Every structure is written in C-alpha cells, then in structure tokens.
Amino acid sequence: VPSHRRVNPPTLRMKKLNWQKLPSNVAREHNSMWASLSSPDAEAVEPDF
Amino acid sequence: TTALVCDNGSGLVKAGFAGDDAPRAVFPSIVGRPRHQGVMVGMGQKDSYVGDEAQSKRGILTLKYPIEHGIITNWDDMEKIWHHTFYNELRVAPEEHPTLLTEAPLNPKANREKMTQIMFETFNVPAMYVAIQAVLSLYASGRTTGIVLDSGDGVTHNVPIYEGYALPHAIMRLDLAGRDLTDYLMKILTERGYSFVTTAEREIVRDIKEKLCYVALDFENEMATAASSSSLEKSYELPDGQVITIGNERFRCPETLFQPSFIGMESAGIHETTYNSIMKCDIDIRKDLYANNVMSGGTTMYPGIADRMQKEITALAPSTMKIKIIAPPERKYSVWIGGSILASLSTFQQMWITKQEYDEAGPSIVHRKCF
Ligand SMILES: Nc1ncnc2c1ncn2[C@@H]1O[C@H](COP(=O)(O)OP(=O)(O)O)[C@@H](O)[C@H]1O
Ligand SMILES: [Mg+2]
Known part of the structure; x- marks a missing residue:
C-alpha cells in the first residue's frame, strides 16, 4: 500500500532536501525495511505539512 | 545587471562588482571569538567577529579559518563570511545580482553540493557560477593555453590547460602554501x-x-x-x-x-610538481606550456620567485626549447580579474545556472555543467 507516496501537493515553493534516491525494486525486496514499512498495518506518522 | 566576482580563497576573500579591474572588498577570512570574560555591559559586544573587525580587535580573539587546505571545513563560519561579504562589504541584495565563485581543483563533490545549496537556498541569487581558480587566472593572463601554478594559503596546485581544455589527469596538488610558511x-x-x-x-x-x-x-x-x-x-x-x-x-x-x-x-x-605535471601532458603540447608558466595567488608575491622559478624549470626541462615565466604584477587578484572578464561576456549568458535549473536538477547540475 503506497501510504508514504500519497502526498498532497503544496501551493508554495520549497527548499529541496538533498539525498541519493534508491531504486524502487531495491527498496521493495522481501527483507528490506521499506517493504515492511509499505504494509498498511505499519504505524504511519502524519507530519504537519 | 552587474554581476559579482567573489573569490573565496583560503587566505583572503576578494570580492567586487563585475566588469571592473580591482576588487572593492579584500578582507581576510577569519572568524574571531572572544576567549576572555566580558565585564562591560552593553555597546554591542557581538559574540563572533568576522573579517576586518576580527583583524582589528584580534588581541582578545581566538581566530578560526573556515577554509583549511582549500576545503571548507567549518560551514557556519563560511556562512558568516558570505553574510559579511554580501551584506556589510558590498551592501547588495543577492537576489538581484549574479555571483561568480571560485574553487580549487580535485575538490570533493559534496563540497560543491553544499556550496550550491547555500548559494541557492540561503543566499538566493538569480544566477551563479563555479570555476577553477587556475582557469580564471589563465583567462586574466589573456591566453587560452598555459600551465598555472596557483599557490594560495593552503594549496599549491599545478593545472595545465591546452586551448581551454583543462587536463584532469595532469593536475596535481601539493599541500604547502602560505600558512605552512x-x-x-x-x-x-x-x-x-x-x-x-x-x-x-x-x-x-x-x-x-x-x-x-x-x-x-x-x-x-x-x-x-x-x-x-x-x-x-x-x-x-x-x-x-x-x-x-x-x-x-x-x-x-x-x-x-x-x-x-x-x-x-x-x-x-x-618545480618538480610543475615538471611532473608537464610529462603527464602530450608531447606535442609541452612546448606551449614551457613558454606559458603562469603564476597566481599571493604566495607568489615574493620578489625573487620568477627568476628562481625560471632557473629551476630550465634546470629541469631540456634546454632545447624556450622557457618563459608569466608573472604579471596583478597576479594576486588575477583570479578576480579573470572572473570579471568571464562575467561580462555575451556568451556567458547561456552558461549561467538559473534557479529553474536548480529546482529541476537539485544542487547537482554544477557537476554536469562545469568542468
Ligand atoms: N605581499 C605579499 N607577500 C608575500 N605573501 C603574501 C603577500 N600578500 C599575500 N600573501 C600571502 O598569500 C595569500 C594571499 O591570499 P590569496 O592567494 O589571494 O587567497 P587564498 O590564499 O586565501 O586562497 C595570503 O595568505 C598571504 O599569506
Ligand atoms: Mg586565493
């Protein structure tokens, strides 16, 4: 379930945080943390956008 | 629109308006912090003196250099240096003026990432540019080709450039300059x-x-x-x-x-660094570099360095061809002069780095854009 990807668009312009983006197939492996975080039963913390 | 040229060297920051001959704001890059106790309450006892104020009141100040061996180590101090050189020295808004900057060869990429992120997030500019110091020194010498020995306060690096192509493998770096002296x-x-x-x-x-x-x-x-x-x-x-x-x-x-x-x-x-840089080039273009030994940086201000340098290269190189040392009197500010030459060019409008390029490609388009 793509809970973290469901981000509303904001109306203003934002400073871009720099990192190195992982590939989607690498993050969605069975023993990665990101697939376990992709579960709907995971504790989704909502940030104040 | 007048651009700004600001060499953020290891020794002294040299800044001014583009299209000019001399930098208006030359000041050393130190952050001075008081080490003793204040007793006199009031009168603006500010906790971190920057630049000429830190130079003048230096008897009670621990001085820190943000740039050590050509590498921006302390970043908050370098931000304070940039804040002083924009707001107090030039007294110009960054958001209405292009700002040329300089950099050492063989730099880390994340250093360029961080400088781009500061020059586009904190001090917002319309456009900016990062160039190699040796390339701008060669431009202020008026020649497209030549070898530049740039000796600053931390780094003495040798860079040969043939017809605008800066040869990457032949660049070397020696960590011996003015602070070590x-x-x-x-x-x-x-x-x-x-x-x-x-x-x-x-x-x-x-x-x-x-x-x-x-x-x-x-x-x-x-x-x-x-x-x-x-x-x-x-x-x-x-x-x-x-x-x-x-x-x-x-x-x-x-x-x-x-x-x-x-x-x-x-x-x-x-001399051996220059000579070993010369053998790393092609044998066709070595002849041009011998007659085009350009110096820059204030560590070349000693008034016996040219004849001794010519003697050392002529001892090192074969004597069949000509050896010549390019040592202009204003080679201290030749980094700034080459920046002022490069900033006011009609072609240089299309090599500017816009905010739209920054927003599309992160603080990372400087790697694929510049050399
Ligand atoms: N007249 C001079 N004679 C000898 N050395 C000088 C002279 N002026 C400056 N220097 C030295 O050269 C350096 C000049 O700084 P510069 O090369 O312009 O930028 P940076 O060294 O900070 O990259 C200073 O650190 C200083 O020690
Ligand atoms: Mg310098």
Whole structure:
C-alpha cells in the first residue's frame, strides 16, 4: 500500500532536501525495511505539512 | 545587471562588482571569538567577529579559518563570511545580482553540493557560477593555453590547460602554501628568542612574511652571504612598539616552497610538481606550456620567485626549447580579474545556472555543467 507516496501537493515553493534516491525494486525486496514499512498495518506518522 | 566576482580563497576573500579591474572588498577570512570574560555591559559586544573587525580587535580573539587546505571545513563560519561579504562589504541584495565563485581543483563533490545549496537556498541569487581558480587566472593572463601554478594559503596546485581544455589527469596538488610558511616562520623565530604561539600572533608573523620575506635566487650563496656579513638583516616594528630584526629567515621561509624537507615532507619542490605535471601532458603540447608558466595567488608575491622559478624549470626541462615565466604584477587578484572578464561576456549568458535549473536538477547540475 503506497501510504508514504500519497502526498498532497503544496501551493508554495520549497527548499529541496538533498539525498541519493534508491531504486524502487531495491527498496521493495522481501527483507528490506521499506517493504515492511509499505504494509498498511505499519504505524504511519502524519507530519504537519 | 552587474554581476559579482567573489573569490573565496583560503587566505583572503576578494570580492567586487563585475566588469571592473580591482576588487572593492579584500578582507581576510577569519572568524574571531572572544576567549576572555566580558565585564562591560552593553555597546554591542557581538559574540563572533568576522573579517576586518576580527583583524582589528584580534588581541582578545581566538581566530578560526573556515577554509583549511582549500576545503571548507567549518560551514557556519563560511556562512558568516558570505553574510559579511554580501551584506556589510558590498551592501547588495543577492537576489538581484549574479555571483561568480571560485574553487580549487580535485575538490570533493559534496563540497560543491553544499556550496550550491547555500548559494541557492540561503543566499538566493538569480544566477551563479563555479570555476577553477587556475582557469580564471589563465583567462586574466589573456591566453587560452598555459600551465598555472596557483599557490594560495593552503594549496599549491599545478593545472595545465591546452586551448581551454583543462587536463584532469595532469593536475596535481601539493599541500604547502602560505600558512605552512607562517607556521615554519613561527618555528624558526624562536631561535632568535621571539615567541609567537597564539593565533593573534599568526597575523603578525604573516605580516612579517608579507613585508620582508623574499625568494633567494641561490640558497647556498645566501647562506654564505648571511653567515659572512650582516647586511641582509632587516628590522620590523611590532604592534606593541618592540622592534625585532630578522636575518636569514627572510629567505629560509619561502625556501620551503622549493625544499619541503624543511617541515618534513617527502615530496619535492613546486618545480618538480610543475615538471611532473608537464610529462603527464602530450608531447606535442609541452612546448606551449614551457613558454606559458603562469603564476597566481599571493604566495607568489615574493620578489625573487620568477627568476628562481625560471632557473629551476630550465634546470629541469631540456634546454632545447624556450622557457618563459608569466608573472604579471596583478597576479594576486588575477583570479578576480579573470572572473570579471568571464562575467561580462555575451556568451556567458547561456552558461549561467538559473534557479529553474536548480529546482529541476537539485544542487547537482554544477557537476554536469562545469568542468
Ligand atoms: N605581499 C605579499 N607577500 C608575500 N605573501 C603574501 C603577500 N600578500 C599575500 N600573501 C600571502 O598569500 C595569500 C594571499 O591570499 P590569496 O592567494 O589571494 O587567497 P587564498 O590564499 O586565501 O586562497 C595570503 O595568505 C598571504 O599569506
Ligand atoms: Mg586565493
């Protein structure tokens, strides 16, 4: 379930945080943390956008 | 719209408006923090003095250099340096003026990432540019080709450029420049009984180095002349009124540039660095680099460095072709002058880095754009 990807668009312009983006197939492996975080039963913390 | 040229060197930040000949704001890059206790309440006792204020009140200030060996180590200090050079020195809004900047060769990429992120998030500009210091020095020399020995305060790097192509493999770097000469001058002044241990005293010894030191044309003859006669002794007045007199230390201190075994480095002098840079080039283009030995940086301000440099290369290189040293009088600011040349060009409008390019491609388009 793509809970973290469901981000509303904001109306203003934002400073871009720099990192190195992982590939989607690498993050969605069975023993990665990101697939376990992709579960709907995971504790989704909502940030104040 | 006038651009801004601001060489953020290791030694002194040199900034001013583009299209001009001289930088308006030359000031050393130090952040001074008070080490003692304040008792006098009021009158704007600000906790971190930057630039000329830190130079003037330096007797109660621990001084820190944000740029060490050509690498921006402390970042908040460098942000304070940029804030002082934009808001207090030039007194211009960054959001309405392009800002040219300079950089050392073989730099880390994340350094360029961080400088791009500061120049687009904190100090917002319409456009900016990062260039190699040797390339701008060659541009201010008026020649497209040549080899540049740029010796600043931390880095002495050799860069050969042929027809605008800066050869990457032939670039080398020697970590021996003006601050190391100042530390060695602190070490050898204790033989005469003068002690300089604090960072405030480093500016005094640096001023001694700037005012009195000179490159010997022959080292052993200057040893023989100094040991024989006391004619080359020169006196200097300290800020407290005391007068010292120095002898051979006027030319033992720049001789570290030719003999790094004084401070204990296995590498040879800048001549061997230049020569080994020359053999890394193609054999067709070596002839042009011999006649185009350009210097920049204030560590080349000693008034015996050109003839000694020509002697050292002519000893090193074969004597079949011509050796020539390009040493202009304004090669201290030739980085800034080359930036002012490059900023006001009609072609240079299409190599600017816009905010739209920043928003599309992160702080990472500087790698694929610039060399
Ligand atoms: N007149 C001079 N004579 C000898 N050395 C100088 C002179 N002026 C400056 N220097 C030295 O060269 C350096 C000049 O700084 P510069 O090369 O312009 O930028 P940076 O060294 O900070 O990259 C200073 O650190 C200083 O020690
Ligand atoms: Mg410099």
